Symmetry: C5
Subunit: 201 residues, 5 copies
């Protein structure tokens, strides 16, 4: 009926350890990085330290509620929620969470989680000081769940990029991938985010 | 009641996950940054490292109590109450909280949480060596709640600044913003603190 | 009694969130900074990185026990206690506490928590290389409790005996005076202890 | 069952602090490091900064379920599992896990925990600029459980540099995994460790 | 008993905050530092950054079990155990525990806690580049319990210069572990120490 009841009901029935696979078809996770800032770039070590928005979207029907005389959306801490086990495959630092750790939950079960991450990556810095800039690929996909459980998909440049960064974005491409691990035959999916940037001076 | 009863009552009944909106109105959150120190400034990267008191104030009627013969205010760990999910939109580091995680709650339900935060931002350092100084804009607002849920508003902000930093405050002006994105048909409010400072 | 029972009574009753106000009088907290080492002096930015034992003392009779054939003191984790919410107003880093966070509890309710803390401060470093040295002031006081709830008092009874013999610096004097602020919002008085650290390079 | 039922049963029955033996036989722990990136090398201090996936495998039959009309394997938080108390014996930094701390649990009781860990080590860095490269040995073994309780043996997958960053200053030449049985703490019992030798060199620009 | 039962009994009955004083006599805690690596040395500031194994042994009779048809030793998370409140008096940094925080408990009540700790200390670094080396003393003892509650002693039964990294930029010459008793001039009680004199030099 009210916000307190929904968050009470959500707290007590949300199964955070349980992926909401429905009729055993994959959970469609939509990940798009909104780049905000690029801090320290190294063309020698091929390392970048970047701040970006991880727009993450999925549906968890275990959260749904009747909206007749009730809020249309609530704000839920992700500790009381299932969050996809996303990992940046080429990160060389642990993701540093800048924002409060809440996701927005819609009454129909849609979940919107977008944390601020400061993280270091190993990618192609060659050409960052040149005219056409450097192209840095960041690969994000489920860490443990394969294609039958989590399906990751892009939304398809950033308008939220800080004008005061020493670097500037030229183009951002994010495409979907499908890989196979060298041990095990089922298929693990990732989204490929290509960051085209250069120095200003 | 005496303090033990109130703090028992607040701990066991507070819905820390629940926003205390009254009759579908937004929680009036009052943000004023009291700047304490600027430690590292870098004009090449346009980054500042700042220590400040993030004075935050709101009203939570679920915390109130009848204070006829009882204390007028208590001190509650912010884990046992709902705190607005504020986030500095232009920060490049996680807030380093230097003070205890306690809030002040008055008998009527007003809550005052003012932690000391050392945090790095990306803002305009250009002109920090000049006479008129550099002006660094910091935009602070709720990360998940929109305008009908949290309304942010400002309330002498250079009275506690360290007389020992290589930097000095010239002017501090605070305006509030309200943005509507092409995604979301709701309005998102933030307080933008423009910090005028220069080199010694 | 015995240690196992005493700590049971403290564990099961002591209200870590509740300040032990008695007859609505302020809780007299006694703060004395025992400086151990000065680790990073910077005269350009006026910043010091210092390690110190924060001798903090108050009385909490909700912990007391009749000390017949019983221990006169035990050792209690700070999670099972109310600890004053002291904060160095001029600190520029999080306090890094080096020792385990146990406090000493006397049978009458007196509590002693004296942790070793490494913390960086913004204070007066100018003159550290001259002979009489620079004096760096540290202001520590309760962050939420005002003058009627927590009263801070220096101990004016003692450093230069626990300071590291291997430090690049040497302590000249340590003086503690009391302060009281009234902030522009609320007609309360908020108390802090101002610890003056007179030190120089050797 | 379904995933929710399995994870309910596992969450509510896990004795995570209890090592999962049976017939008082040692737990078959299989550890093999897949190196992902070499970040900082220091030839003067003989210190290396490395990112690697620590593929760890053991069998815990208490997690098993009848898989008839049921999921084949699920994903369980390592907080709801016993994980071997493995430690890099020559480490000079705390292990930093970059990935979610989830393990993969199969209906037969098999567990797959493969975290991406960035850690600094003390090993022989001398020769990283030569052609044949430097050899960095990493000693991994249980910190408290001995050979009769935890036996470490490295695993089988494929290429030694199949997940190694092509953008690292360095390139892997060979990755060797050897098993040992020596003495830790004091004297009796047999204490096993896996010795992972990392052959790497600077890249030829 | 089986492994799960013993660890259950310890979890539910171990008094982690309660010191296990025996016959109202002090708890004999035995400290031995196994030096593993010397990382950063600074002769001007007199600071060393060290990785070492803190081998700790004590007896807690409340932890025991009849070892009949049951395991003779288990590994218990120190969250379910009493661990002495040891602190390095000469430390200038957080002790960085690198290993899992499990302790080994024998059916007789003896407990073994030996974590790998990376910590910085303030000691005499002068002479680290010379032939005889510097002597860096590290004093380890209980932080809140005094001598009649906790008695701290070295384990000299220690062979510690045996696990040191051959690849450290520095080399150990001597390690002495002696017993000390430090009394602060404020207060009459005395806190016992292990005094580790670490004689090492640069290569
Ligand atoms: C508050 O308490 C006083 C004292 O009992 C009572 O007279 C008064 O009606 C109360 N006010 C409320 C509940 O608003
Ligand atoms: C405390 O000491 C005695 C001895 O056990 C105890 O019986 C008594 O109740 C207490 N004495 C007083 C005066 O309260
Ligand atoms: C322990 O149990 C064994 C048999 O289970 C028995 O022989 C022995 O006496 C017991 N120890 C004690 C002290 O009762
Ligand atoms: C700036 C601040 N908050 C937001 C956005 C941008 C974009 C989306 C969004 C969705 C829910 C809550 N907040 C935001
Ligand atoms: C420093 C510390 N605490 C405070 C202030 C300054 C100012 C106002 C205030 C109001 C209530 C509680 N604490 C404080």
């Amino acid at each position: 009926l009210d916000r307190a009841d929904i968050l009470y009901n959500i707290r007590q029935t949300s199964r955070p350890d349980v992926i909401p696979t429905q009729r055993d078809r994959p959970v469609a996770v939509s990940v798009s990085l909104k780049f905000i800032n690029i801090l320290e770039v190294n063309e020698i070590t091929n390392e970048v330290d970047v701040v970006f928005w991880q727009q993450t979207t999925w549906s968890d029907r275990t959260l749904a509620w009747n909206s007749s005389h009730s809020p249309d959306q609530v704000s839920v801490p992700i500790s009381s929620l299932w969050v996809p086990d996303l990992a940046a495959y080429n990160a060389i630092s642990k993701p540093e969470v800048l924002t409060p750790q809440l996701a927005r939950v819609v009454s129909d079960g849609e979940v919107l989680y977008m944390p601020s991450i400061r993280q270091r990556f190993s990618c192609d810095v060659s050409g960052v000081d040149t005219e056409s800039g450097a192209t840095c690929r960041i690969k994000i996909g489920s860490w443990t769940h394969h294609s039958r459980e989590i399906s990751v998909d892009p939304t398809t440049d950033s308008e939220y990029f800080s004008q005061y960064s020493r670097f500037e974005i030229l183009d951002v491409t994010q495409k979907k991938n499908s890989v196979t691990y060298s041990c095990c035959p089922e298929a693990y999916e990732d989204v490929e985010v290509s960051l085209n940037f250069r120095k200003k001076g």
